[PDB]
Design a protein around this ligand. Structure first.
Ligand SMILES: O=C(O)CCSc1ncnc2ccccc12
Ligand SMILES: *[C@@H]1O[C@H](CO)[C@@H](O)[C@H](O)[C@H]1NC(C)=O
Length: 344
């Protein structure tokens, strides 16, 4: 089990002003640290945040969090469930800021809610340095869904934070799961993440990585929430995990089979595959699904005969091509479940 620690700096808060926090299981002797960002959509104005507070309150508040959590998948400490990093120090950071991990705004008289996702990450890192992170060799910032996008937005800032604090020997890396989205046309028109993120950035006081911000400039920072645009600006090594037919992508595209829809789905998979062509560390199976890395059966899916835990181990070796140890694994078949190992 991982044990809850509420942040000692109680000014770094969840949406409702309760303290943010993290769950920790230490592994004495290991100098590897895994910090995982939870996902769960977002909210972008008073009315849709009020609805989320009524029926999704654990994503906006720490008042009801349990004292412990069980680590699963890549957060498991059992080698049978986690062949990759079972002996690492494990950290689960709950998503309670509703801002894709981008916000830097406190609650006040002008603000009903606080949006502090980017500051939550920075404060967790600061407080862990006194609990053993100061001796680390590798810090892997991982995350799923909105948390995967959060990795892309924050990995280089964590690297800069550790450098400025005097820890240049900690190698910061990213693992973005199910957070690589396309700003494409909907199958039927119905809002869209581009517009919601444009509004959210203003509502949250949201921040993006510096080099990407300098490319797109004022009013266009929403572009940096899209993996294929922000990834080439990043300096830290980042491994990208993405289903070719991701369920959250299809939801925003208003897809729920005749020729028009068949062509739409085939084109989506081809576009996603194109965006990953020049991403050297990637795992992209041809499945209709959502998230993978903290699921207990994450070991089961394979691309070209290689599992995700194996690909991640090969990535570690590459950062010390390798014979029989590949790191770029993207399916070429064009329809969901053309890969027989897709989740049932
Ligand atoms: O968090 C989750 O469970 C999945 C929904 S997140 C998401 N879905 C669709 N498009 C996006 C575009 C930018 C950032 C986040 C998203
Ligand atoms: C607490 O966090 C806030 C927001 O990040 C920061 O401005 C402040 O300096 C922090 N104070 C301490 C003592 O860590």
């Amino acid at each position: 089990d991982l044990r809850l620690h509420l942040l000692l700096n109680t000014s770094v808060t969840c949406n409702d002003g309760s303290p943010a926090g993290y769950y920790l299981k230490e592994s004495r002797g290991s100098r590897r640290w895994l910090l995982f960002l939870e996902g769960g959509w977002y909210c972008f104005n008073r009315e849709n945040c009020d609805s989320r507070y009524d029926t999704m309150r654990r994503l906006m508040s720490s008042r009801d969090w349990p004292r412990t959590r069980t680590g699963t998948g890549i957060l498991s400490s059992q080698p049978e469930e986690n062949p990759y990093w079972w002996n690492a120090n494990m950290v689960f950071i709950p998503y309670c800021s509703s801002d894709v991990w981008s916000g830097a705004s406190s609650k006040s008289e002008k603000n009903e809610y606080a949006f502090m996702g980017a500051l939550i990450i920075q404060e967790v890192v600061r407080e862990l340095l006194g609990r053993g992170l100061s001796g680390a060799k590798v810090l892997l910032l991982a995350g799923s869904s909105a948390g995967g996008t959060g990795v892309l937005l924050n990995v280089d800032r964590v690297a800069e934070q550790l450098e400025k604090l005097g820890y240049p020997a900690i190698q910061v890396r990213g693992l973005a799961d199910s957070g690589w989205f396309l700003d494409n046309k909907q199958y039927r028109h119905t809002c869209a993440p581009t517009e919601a993120i444009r509004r959210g950035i203003r509502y949250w006081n949201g921040v993006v990585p510096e080099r990407c911000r300098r490319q797109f400039q004022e009013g266009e920072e929403w572009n940096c929430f899209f993996g294929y645009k922000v990834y080439p600006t990043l300096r830290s090594p980042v491994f990208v995990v993405q289903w070719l037919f991701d369920e959250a992508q299809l939801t925003v595209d208003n897809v729920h089979v005749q020729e028009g829809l068949r062509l739409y789905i085939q084109n989506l998979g081809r576009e996603l595959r194109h965006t990953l062509k020049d991403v050297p560390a990637s795992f992209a199976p041809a499945c209709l699904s959502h998230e993978i890395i903290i699921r207990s059966h994450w070991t089961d899916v394979q691309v070209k005969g290689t599992s995700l835990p194996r690909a991640l181990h090969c990535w570690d070796r590459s950062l010390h091509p390798l014979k029989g140890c590949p790191v770029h694994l993207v399916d070429s078949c064009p329809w969901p479940h053309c890969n027989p190992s897709c989740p049932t």
